[PDB]
């Protein structure tokens, strides 16, 4: 059980991260106009709210820990549950770590005016250091998590307050909503994906649904309030960015938040805001490392991965399964060496939203195959909100496939590599 306000804070903390500080580059480089990027943010938030409600329904139906793995295992089959676990193990969490390490290195270089050639070495060093820190037990990781969660709200609030009162802010800063050079149809998909990365992490509402005290009255209010607060914060931050900088200026830099802070609080305030952004990125990497470490243990304890004994090995000193962390760190380093922030974020969004759309279809199927299950929480408008979430997910998947064949091919190839691993592991019993 958890208090209603406590769940609100949990949702706001998990969803909000370092995407808002860096994704505006992609959003306003694709959209190309101040108004279309804001529309992308709003649409992404609406889709996130609908998906959160839909996922929370099944989370209440199946309160067992694990999340999408458990949901898809129970609805479709064990093979798809393992497929979700494997995709999270080899794409989602490694790519999140790689992308956040790359952006941390980029922001660090910008802050300290170092050469751009040190971005990859930095990213690698910080990823290794954070993984090693997480290997020393949950104490330091929890301390970092709490500190980053507390501190990441300060730069956002400061930027919003300062930019909204910038000398020149006004409705004129949000025009013309479209530039002929960027067609609305093609560019809006890329803008939507870029915004959707900033909303990542909302899938934990389903996991928290089972823990919630009294779903069905607090769960809808909690989810709607938390995701609406996240959407409002993102919209206000983007409005502040547009007040301080133009759409072209935001698209022309890899650190929009740093540039806006430099314009707002010249002197030491810009440096402090940049350090806050770096701390937020650090906390994001740490949280992703923890959540990712939790996955290979779950897969191995069910004898679903090769050398499941090795993966499920528990460290006597810290009582942590380290080997899965090492595998994820290796994959993340490989991604860092041969990847980019925007590309990795797009891949993450593509794979996670494919599986999330599968989860929505699972909710719809459960509403039909097993109408008699005890449902503590029912989605508000069954024929409308799940349909909106599924339409959003399908649009994301198809737009990414059409616009980024290489990224979609990479994700599909990794998952299809996972499949024969599943069959071999079933044959050999771990």
């Amino acid at each position: 059980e958890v208090s209603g306000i406590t769940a609100l804070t949990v949702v706001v903390g998990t969803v909000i991260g370092a995407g808002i500080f860096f994704k505006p580059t992609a959003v306003y480089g694709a959209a190309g106009a101040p108004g279309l990027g804001l529309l992308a943010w709003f649409v992404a938030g609406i889709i996130t709210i609908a998906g959160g409600l839909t996922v929370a329904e099944i989370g209440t139906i199946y309160p067992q820990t694990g999340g999408m793995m458990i949901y898809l295992e129970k609805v479709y089959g064990r093979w798809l549950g393992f497929l979700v676990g494997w995709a999270q193990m080899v794409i989602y969490y490694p790519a999140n770590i790689a992308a956040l390490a790359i952006i941390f290195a980029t922001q660090f270089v910008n802050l300290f005016a170092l050469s751009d050639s040190t971005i990859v070495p930095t990213a690698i060093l910080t990823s290794i250091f954070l993984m090693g820190v997480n290997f020393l037990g949950t104490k330091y990781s929890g301390w970092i998590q709490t500190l980053a969660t507390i501190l990441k709200l300060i730069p956002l609030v400061v930027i919003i307050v300062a930019g909204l009162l910038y000398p020149g802010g006004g409705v004129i800063r949000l025009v013309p909503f479209s530039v002929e050079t960027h067609p609305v149809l093609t560019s809006f998909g890329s803008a939507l994906i870029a915004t959707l990365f900033a909303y990542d992490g909302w899938i934990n509402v389903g996991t928290l649904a089972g823990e919630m005290k009294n779903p069905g009255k607090m769960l809808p209010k909690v989810i709607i309030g938390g995701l609406s607060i996240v959407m409002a914060v993102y919209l206000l931050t983007n409005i502040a960015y547009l007040f301080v900088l133009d759409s072209s200026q935001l698209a022309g830099t890899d650190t929009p938040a740093a540039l806006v802070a430099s314009h707002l609080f010249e002197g030491i305030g810009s440096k402090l805001v940049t350090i806050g952004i770096l701390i937020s990125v650090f906390g994001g990497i740490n949280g992703y490392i923890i959540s990712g470490l939790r996955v290979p243990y779950a897969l191995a304890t069910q004898k679903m991965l090769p050398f499941s004994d090795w993966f499920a090995r528990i460290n006597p000193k810290t009582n942590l399964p380290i080997n899965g962390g090492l595998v994820m760190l290796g994959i993340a380093i490989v991604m860092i060496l041969t990847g980019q922030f925007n590309q990795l974020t797009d891949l993450i969004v593509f794979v996670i939203w494919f599986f999330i759309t599968l989860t929505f279809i699972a909710v719809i199927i459960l509403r039909k195959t097993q109408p008699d299950i005890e449902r503590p929480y029912r989605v508000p408008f069954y024929p409308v909100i799940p349909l909106i979430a599924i339409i959003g997910g399908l649009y994301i998947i198809f737009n990414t496939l059409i616009v980024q064949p290489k990224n979609a091919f990479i994700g599909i190839l990794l998952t299809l590599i996972g499949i024969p691993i599943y069959f071999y592991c079933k044959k050999k019993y771990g």
């Epitope: 949950t138 939790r294 243990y297 528990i314 006597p316 009582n319 942590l320």
Partner: nanobody, 116 residues
């Protein structure tokens, strides 16, 4: 989920006590059983842990003297505190945790003190 300890008590320095800890209601074979130390007005500090696969970890201050052993047949864990020393006096708890992020199961806690 109970964890009943025993074996602690007053002992002369340099003695040897074994702290049995019978665990019931948990998947003992799958759990990593540990022994913690909580000095007065402090927080529990790990003394020794043994994983489900037999791998063991010992605190630097007890390494070479303490020996943690588990026997899944009777669902008990022992801690042979050989060559006790006066600073070793504290209250020793019996823990049973599946994984670092799982729920921690604690015993009633046993008091062991070294007279000399």
């Amino acid at each position: 989920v109970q964890l009943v300890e025993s074996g602690g008590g007053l002992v002369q320095a340099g003695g040897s006590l074994r702290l049995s800890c019978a665990a019931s209601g948990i998947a003992f074979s799958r759990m990593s059983m540990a022994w913690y130390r909580q000095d007065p007005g402090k927080q529990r500090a790990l003394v020794a842990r043994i994983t489900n696969d037999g791998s063991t970890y010992y605190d630097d201050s007890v390494k070479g003297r303490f020996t943690i052993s588990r026997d899944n047949a009777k669902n008990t864990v022992h801690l042979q505190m050989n060559s006790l020393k006066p600073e070793d006096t504290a209250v020793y708890y019996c823990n049973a945790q599946l994984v670092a992020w799982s729920e921690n199961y604690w015993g009633q806690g046993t008091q062991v003190t070294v007279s000399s």
